[PDB]
Design a binder for this molecule. Structure first.
Ligand SMILES: CC(C)CS(=O)(=O)NC(=O)c1ccc2c(c1)N(CC1CCC1)C[C@H](c1ccc(Cl)cc1Cl)O2
Length: 146
C-alpha cells in the first residue's frame, strides 16, 4: 500500500519532529513538499486554535498507552462528521502533533510512532478514494500553495 506508506512517513516525521524539536523513502520529493506545507499550516492551526487544543488534550487526559489506544474511537467519529477537505485533514494531523508534544513531555515518547499509525489508519482508510482523486499529497501541497 504505497499511499499508506507515504502518508505514514509524512505523519510520523511531522509528529516526531514536533515532539522532539529536531528534524529527521519513495516519492520523497513530494513528501518533502508535503512535510514543508504541513510544518507551515499545521503549526498555524496549532497556534491559532491553541485554547481548543489545550482543552481537548486536557479532557482526553492521556497518561499512558491505553489512553492513546482509546484515542482512535473519538478520532474516527469526529473526523468523519464534517465534509471531506484538506483543512479537516490538517486539524486531524495537527492535533496529533499536539498529542505527540504531550507524550514526549510526560515521558511517553514511545507512544508517538503508534499514534502516527492510528492517525494514518483513520486518514487513509476512511478517505482513501478521496485522496486518490486529489492525487494524494500533491493535492495537499497544491491546495495550500502560497
Ligand atoms: C467543533 C469542531 C471540532 C467541528 S469540526 O468538524 O471542525 N472538527 C474537525 O474537523 C475535527 C477533525 C479531526 C479531529 C478533530 C476535529 N479533533 C477535535 C478538535 C481538536 C480541537 C477540537 C481532534 C481529532 C484527533 C486528532 C488526532 C488525535 Cl491523536 C486525537 C484526536 Cl481526538 O481530530
Amino acid at each position: 500500500d504505497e499511499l499508506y506508506r507515504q502518508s505514514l512517513e509524512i505523519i510520523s516525521r511531522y509528529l516526531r519532529e514536533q515532539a522532539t524539536g529536531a528534524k529527521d523513502g519513495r516519492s520523497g520529493a513530494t513528501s518533502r513538499k508535503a512535510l514543508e506545507t504541513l510544518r507551515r499550516v499545521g503549526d498555524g492551526v496549532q497556534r491559532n486554535h491553541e485554547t481548543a487544543f489545550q482543552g481537548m488534550l486536557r479532557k482526553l487526559d492521556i497518561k499512558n498507552e491505553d489512553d492513546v489506544k482509546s484515542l482512535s474511537r473519538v478520532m474516527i467519529h469526529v473526523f468523519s462528521d464534517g465534509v471531506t477537505n484538506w483543512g479537516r485533514i490538517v486539524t486531524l494531523i495537527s492535533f496529533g502533533a499536539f498529542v505527540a508534544k504531550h507524550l514526549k513531555t510526560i515521558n511517553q515518547e514511545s507512544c508517538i510512532e503508534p499514534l502516527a499509525e492510528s492517525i494514518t489508519d483513520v486518514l487513509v482508510r476512511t478517505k482513501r478514494d478521496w485522496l486518490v482523486k486529489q492525487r494524494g499529497w500533491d493535492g495537499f501541497v497544491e491546495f495550500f500553495h502560497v
